[PDB]
Write a protein that holds these residues in place. Structure first.
Motif, short mmCIF file in Angstrom:
data_model
loop_
_atom_site.label_atom_id
_atom_site.label_comp_id
_atom_site.label_asym_id
_atom_site.label_seq_id
_atom_site.Cartn_x
_atom_site.Cartn_y
_atom_site.Cartn_z
N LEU A 1 13.62 -110.44 32.63
CA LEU A 1 12.77 -111.47 32.09
C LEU A 1 11.54 -111.66 32.98
CD1 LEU A 1 16.05 -113.19 31.46
CD2 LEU A 1 14.32 -113.23 29.63
N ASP A 2 10.53 -112.37 32.48
CA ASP A 2 9.32 -112.59 33.27
C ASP A 2 9.49 -113.68 34.32
OD1 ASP A 2 8.75 -113.77 30.28
OD2 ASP A 2 8.22 -115.24 31.82
N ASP A 3 8.43 -113.90 35.08
CA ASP A 3 8.41 -114.95 36.09
C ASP A 3 7.19 -115.85 35.92
OD1 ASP A 3 10.62 -115.20 38.03
OD2 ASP A 3 9.01 -115.60 39.47
N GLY A 4 7.02 -116.37 34.71
CA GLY A 4 6.04 -117.39 34.44
C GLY A 4 6.64 -118.77 34.67
N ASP A 5 7.93 -118.79 35.00
CA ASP A 5 8.63 -120.02 35.33
C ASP A 5 8.86 -120.16 36.84
OD1 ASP A 5 10.45 -117.87 35.25
OD2 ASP A 5 12.14 -119.15 34.69
N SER A 6 8.61 -119.08 37.58
CA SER A 6 8.77 -119.07 39.04
C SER A 6 10.24 -119.20 39.48
CB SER A 6 7.92 -120.17 39.69
N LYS A 7 11.14 -118.60 38.70
CA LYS A 7 12.57 -118.66 39.00
C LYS A 7 12.85 -117.95 40.32
N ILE A 8 12.33 -116.73 40.43
CA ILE A 8 12.44 -115.94 41.65
C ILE A 8 11.97 -116.71 42.88
CG2 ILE A 8 11.10 -114.19 42.86
CD1 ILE A 8 13.34 -113.93 39.77
N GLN A 9 10.75 -117.23 42.81
CA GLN A 9 10.16 -118.01 43.89
C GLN A 9 11.16 -119.02 44.44
OE1 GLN A 9 5.92 -119.35 44.75
NE2 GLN A 9 6.56 -120.74 43.09
N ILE B 1 8.19 -108.46 44.41
CA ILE B 1 9.00 -109.40 45.16
C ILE B 1 8.31 -109.88 46.43
CG2 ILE B 1 11.10 -109.68 46.52
CD1 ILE B 1 12.60 -108.32 44.22
N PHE B 2 7.75 -108.94 47.21
CA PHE B 2 6.99 -109.25 48.44
C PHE B 2 5.83 -110.16 48.13
CE2 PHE B 2 8.52 -104.90 49.90
CZ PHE B 2 9.48 -105.41 50.76
N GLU B 3 5.04 -109.80 47.11
CA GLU B 3 3.92 -110.64 46.68
C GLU B 3 4.31 -112.10 46.52
OE1 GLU B 3 1.17 -109.79 43.15
OE2 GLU B 3 2.10 -111.69 42.52
N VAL B 4 5.59 -112.33 46.25
CA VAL B 4 6.10 -113.67 46.03
C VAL B 4 6.65 -114.21 47.32
CG1 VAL B 4 7.80 -115.03 44.79
CG2 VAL B 4 6.70 -113.05 43.70
N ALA B 5 7.31 -113.32 48.06
CA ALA B 5 7.93 -113.64 49.33
C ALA B 5 6.87 -114.05 50.35
CB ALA B 5 8.73 -112.46 49.84
N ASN B 6 5.66 -113.53 50.19
CA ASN B 6 4.56 -113.93 51.05
C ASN B 6 4.24 -115.40 50.82
OD1 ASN B 6 2.35 -114.16 52.76
ND2 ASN B 6 1.17 -112.49 51.83
N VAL C 1 5.77 -117.80 50.36
CA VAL C 1 6.79 -118.74 50.83
C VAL C 1 7.01 -118.45 52.32
CG1 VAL C 1 9.06 -119.77 50.35
CG2 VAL C 1 7.80 -118.64 48.50
N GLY C 2 6.05 -117.72 52.89
CA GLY C 2 6.01 -117.43 54.32
C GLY C 2 7.18 -116.62 54.82
N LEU C 3 7.54 -115.58 54.08
CA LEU C 3 8.73 -114.79 54.40
C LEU C 3 8.39 -113.38 54.81
CD1 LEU C 3 10.71 -116.22 51.50
CD2 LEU C 3 11.35 -116.51 53.90
N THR C 4 7.10 -113.10 54.95
CA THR C 4 6.67 -111.78 55.36
C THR C 4 6.21 -111.80 56.81
OG1 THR C 4 4.48 -112.26 54.49
CG2 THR C 4 6.01 -111.10 53.07
N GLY C 5 6.03 -113.00 57.34
CA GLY C 5 5.47 -113.16 58.67
C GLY C 5 6.24 -112.44 59.76
N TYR C 6 6.08 -112.90 60.99
CA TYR C 6 6.98 -112.51 62.06
C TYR C 6 8.18 -113.45 61.94
CZ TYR C 6 2.86 -110.12 63.93
OH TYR C 6 1.76 -109.31 64.08
N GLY C 7 9.27 -113.12 62.63
CA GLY C 7 10.50 -113.87 62.45
C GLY C 7 11.22 -113.40 61.20
N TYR C 8 10.45 -112.80 60.29
CA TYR C 8 11.02 -112.16 59.12
C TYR C 8 10.86 -110.64 59.12
CZ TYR C 8 11.65 -116.90 57.42
OH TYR C 8 12.03 -118.21 57.28
N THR C 9 11.99 -109.95 59.08
CA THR C 9 12.03 -108.50 59.01
C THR C 9 12.74 -108.02 57.73
OG1 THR C 9 12.52 -108.82 61.37
CG2 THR C 9 12.21 -106.57 60.60
N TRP C 10 12.11 -107.13 56.98
CA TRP C 10 12.70 -106.61 55.76
C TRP C 10 13.09 -105.15 55.89
CZ3 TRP C 10 12.75 -109.55 51.06
CH2 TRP C 10 12.20 -110.82 51.23
N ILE C 11 14.36 -104.86 55.64
CA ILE C 11 14.80 -103.47 55.58
C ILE C 11 15.01 -103.08 54.11
CG2 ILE C 11 16.28 -101.79 56.69
CD1 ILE C 11 17.02 -103.77 58.71
#
Ligand SMILES: *[C@@H]1O[C@H](CO)[C@@H](O[C@@H]2O[C@H](CO)[C@@H](O[C@@H]3O[C@H](CO[C@H]4O[C@H](CO)[C@@H](O)[C@H](O)[C@@H]4O)[C@@H](O)[C@H](O[C@H]4O[C@H](CO)[C@@H](O)[C@H](O)[C@@H]4O)[C@@H]3O)[C@H](O)[C@H]2NC(C)=O)[C@H](O)[C@H]1NC(C)=O
Ligand SMILES: C[C@@H](CN1CCC(Cc2ccccc2)CC1)[C@@H](O)c1ccc(O)cc1
Ligand SMILES: *[C@@H]1O[C@H](CO)[C@@H](O)[C@H](O)[C@H]1NC(C)=O
Ligand SMILES: *[C@H]1O[C@H](CO)[C@@H](O)[C@H](O)[C@H]1NC(C)=O
Ligand SMILES: *[C@H]1O[C@H](CO)[C@@H](O)[C@H](O)[C@H]1NC(C)=O
Ligand code: NA
Lengths: 355, 356
Positions: free
Chosen positions: B172-180, B203-208, B210-220
């Motif tokens: 489904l789409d994310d015009g409701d911001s469910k993922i966010q 996903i990253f575009e959204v994760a940014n 919410v400040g989840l791409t910064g330092y302190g955050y590592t994605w594997i």
């Protein structure tokens, strides 16, 4: 001149094509069509699945269909779910009841106007509340469909509990082993999920072990009392039939109805792009697809020939209605219906096994 | 010595020269390189169905230059309907495919979801990163991924701590911001992410946001997300770690080499133990008819092949047995830098202290 949107369909026969063609025509009539107007685009099934997939591409997707309706033939709807699923074009199952298609992980853009077999659990459940069976044995074939139904019923059980679940290898002919393991338990309500040919196998072994006698309850589904499965089915068995569940025509009329409403709801929004014209060269999903699934997936059509149309999270019909069947003196006898939410017991008395 | 037809469909710009540059068995390979322009279903199905009538092809080696995992799926289909072996040796054709048909004879170069996720944990151990959360979509394999993690965490005297596990719906789409909303609930230094390249860009575009791409955050993330390394979507966070098939060490003509190896060797073995090798289908337009006359008795062999002194064996779920892995790190210049190698079940890292 309005914009022409195409809906497509893969149906059983040229008579049903004509029905689809006419269903859309009436949607066009029933609706305000100054801006958008539906057109019907259909084919019938192909001999094997590669020829089918291609047919989708050449015949349907080549016409930018926003949706594809799919029935059975007179060879599953899988090559259709994939080809169309490749672009995120929604595919609507008219008659398939297998539980595979409820899996969003491989059939993402799939929804159906009929429930999967495994949803029969909702009825077996209201049924255990009614006749106060609190202890049951569940016997399922160890295939996807078998586990689907086991998964479905355990969900509702967490009242009445399930004493043991006995899973068996599909295609087996001598289940005396499995069955005797079930005989030892105090519980005498038995719930079976298995194909026709595995129904038959259970039913026999069940007899030569004196478990289809009196004091036993056998509760099953539609597959377990259809065709070959009936030839050896013990009397006093309760089973279900999905009402209208095999009326392709009934379901074409209703699918087209829901879809035409969704198409109209959709164009109330903006940034609506057309699906890709043709397969060759296009490898990007249809951008508007996931939205259009969202619009369908939460449609509601209430005065529908097959009853009340409405889809759950997995895109499966809800408020599906079942005939409650009792094998009496070797005749399938209707003892009631499940009407979507309620059990309604009719005048014809249930003869259990033994009685 | 008789000749078996082996088609090699190289998609996109490729050097037919070195490919054609790179075998005394019991039967000989009559190879024929074919290029293909497109990778949608009608193109790929058609190209292969045609080629199969023109010649008598007993095998297929498929390589492409894209990040389309759906190519792996299209192939598995093609493979199972026609009962022809198909090798996705490089590209989309090579991406993790979970739950391939029972009847298929489709094998891919590269590590299984279960194995990558193992690799991802050895790393986290090297650097004593024991606290982490998982995020996946509904992409096939997602269950194998989470479950492989869990039975490791469960069976380990190491201090693992799986903090949350999010399943995101991209049907489904994310015009409701469910993922966010979901993402905003993560609070861990490490975040294993299972999904697809195009899925992850979003996903990253959204994760940014919410400040989840910064330092302190590592994605594997696994191979299919890194995808092809010469392509880095702008929304991939720098600092992103990822496993990868060593397209560096082990490049195309070497892959097409073993491609033709496995199909030939396996053919030999079966003319030996049985004095025959299954006839190639003449046409896909006739699969209902000719079905009782076909089978997958070659899988017994396509799997277990030793060549040039290397076990080029496959698993059951159709992925390579022990492939060479590089661990790569998306750097400050947004290029992918190699930072570790995986050999047996041994992982060797370049750094002792992790880079910034
Ligand atoms: C499948 O079968 C079920 C069960 O029969 C049907 O569902 C019920 O449907 C009826 C009719 O639509 C509903 O009826 C109305 O109930 C109101 C009050 O409801 C309560 O109390 C009952 C009894 O415990 C509970 O079941 C229910 O939850 C409520 O707590 C009344 O106020 C209504 O009256 C007004 O309208 C009626 C006409 O509808 C007039 O006659 C009156 O004068 C008045 O103006 C009315 O009787 C009922 O509430 C439903 N029950 C439940 C629990 O769902 C389904 O319709 C049927 N489904 C399908 C698909 O056919
Ligand atoms: C896996 C895909 C489905 N997939 C796309 C490619 C298609 C391949 C194919 C097309 C035509 C003929 C044969 C094979 C078959 C269906 C989808 O469910 C999905 C997408 C994203 C996601 O998070 C989860 C699930
Ligand atoms: C495919 O495309 C390439 C690049 O445009 C071209 O060289 C080639 O001739 C094309 N193939 C066909 C169908 O001729
Ligand atoms: C089902 O098909 C349509 C439903 O609209 C109806 O006209 C017909 O009578 C029904 N037939 C059966 C098999 O009951
Ligand atoms: C495959 O062949 C090898 C080498 O000939 C041999 O060790 C073994 O019997 C086979 N491997 C498997 C999977 O049994
Ligand atoms: Na679905």
């Amino acid at each position: 001149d309005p914009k022409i949107v195409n809906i497509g369909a893969v149906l059983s026969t040229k008579k049903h094509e004509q029905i689809f063609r006419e269903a859309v025509n009436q949607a066009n009539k029933r609706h305000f069509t100054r801006k958008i107007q539906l057109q019907a685009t259909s084919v019938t099934h192909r001999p094997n699945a590669i020829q089918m997939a291609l047919s989708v591409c050449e015949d349907l997707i080549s016409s930018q269909v926003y949706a594809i309706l799919v029935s059975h033939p007179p060879l599953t709807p899988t090559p259709i779910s994939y080809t169309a699923g490749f672009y995120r074009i929604p595919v609507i199952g008219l008659t398939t009841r297998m539980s595979i298609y409820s899996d969003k992980s491989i059939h993402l853009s799939f929804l159906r106007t009929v429930p999967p077999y495994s949803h029969q659990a909702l009825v077996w459940f209201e049924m255990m509340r009614l006749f106060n069976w609190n202890h049951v044995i569940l016997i399922v074939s160890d295939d996807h469909e078998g586990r689907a139904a086991q998964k479905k019923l355990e969900t509702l059980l967490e009242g009445p509990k399930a004493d043991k679940v006995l899973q068996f290898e599909p295609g087996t002919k001598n289940l005396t082993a499995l069955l005797l393991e079930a005989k030892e338990l105090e519980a005498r309500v038995i719930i079976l999920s298995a194909s026709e040919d595995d129904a038959t196998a259970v039913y026999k072994s069940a007899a030569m072990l004196d478990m289809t006698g009196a004091g036993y309850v056998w509760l099953v589904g539609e597959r377990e009392i259809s065709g070959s499965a009936l030839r050896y089915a013990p009397d006093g068995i309760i089973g279900l039939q999905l009402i209208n569940g095999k009326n392709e025509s009934a379901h074409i009329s209703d699918a087209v109805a829901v879809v035409a409403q969704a198409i109209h709801e959709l164009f109330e929004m903006e940034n609506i792009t057309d699906p890709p014209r043709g397969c060759v060269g296009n490898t990007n999903i249809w951008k508007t697809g996931p939205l259009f699934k969202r619009v369908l997936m939460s449609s509601k059509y209430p005065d529908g020939v097959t009853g009340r149309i409405e889809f759950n999270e997995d895109g499966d019909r809800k408020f599906a209605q079942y005939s409650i069947m009792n094998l009496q003196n070797r005749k399938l006898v209707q003892v009631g219906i499940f009407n979507g939410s309620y059990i309604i017991q009719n005048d014809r008395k249930i003869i259990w096994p033994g009685g | 010595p008789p000749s078996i037809g082996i088609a090699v469909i190289l998609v996109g710009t490729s050097d037919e020269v070195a490919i054609k540059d790179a075998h005394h068995l019991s039967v000989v390979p009559r190879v024929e390189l074919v290029a293909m322009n497109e990778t949608d279903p009608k193109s790929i199905i058609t190209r292969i169905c045609d080629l199969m009538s023109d010649r008598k092809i007993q095998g297929v080696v498929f390589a492409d230059d894209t990040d389309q995992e759906a190519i792996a799926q299209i192939l598995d289909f093609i493979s199972a309907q026609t009962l022809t072996p198909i090798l996705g040796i490089h590209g989309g054709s090579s991406m993790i495919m979970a739950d391939k048909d029972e009847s298929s004879m489709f094998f891919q170069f590269g590590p299984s979801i279960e194995q990558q996720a193992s690799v991802m944990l050895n790393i986290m151990e090297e650097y004593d990163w024991y606290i982490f959360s998982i995020v996946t979509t509904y992409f096939p394999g997602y269950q194998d991924f989470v479950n492989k993690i869990r039975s490791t965490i469960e069976n380990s005297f190491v201090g693992w701590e799986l903090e949350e596990v999010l399943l995101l719906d991209m049907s489904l789409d994310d015009g409701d911001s469910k993922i966010q909303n979901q993402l905003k609930k993560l609070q861990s230094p490490i975040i294993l992410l299972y999904c697809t390249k195009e899925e992850a860009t979003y996903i990253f575009e959204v994760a940014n946001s919410v400040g989840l791409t910064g330092y302190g955050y590592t994605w594997i993330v696994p191979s299919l997300v890194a995808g092809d390394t010469d392509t880095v979507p702008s929304e991939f966070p720098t600092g992103l770690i990822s496993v990868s098939y060593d397209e560096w060490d082990y490049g195309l003509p070497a892959r097409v080499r073993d491609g033709i190896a496995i199909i030939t060797t396996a053919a030999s073995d079966m003319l030996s133990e049985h004095s025959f090798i299954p006839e190639p289908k003449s046409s896909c337009y006739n699969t209902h008819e000719k079905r009782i006359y076909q089978s997958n008795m070659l899988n017994r062999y396509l799997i277990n092949v030793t060549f040039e002194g290397r076990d080029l064996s496959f698993s059951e779920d159709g992925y390579q047995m022990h492939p060479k892995l590089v661990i790569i790190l998306l750097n400050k210049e947004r290029k992918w830098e190699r930072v570790g190698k995986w050999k047996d079940k041994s992982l060797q890292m370049k750094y002792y202290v992790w880079p910034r």
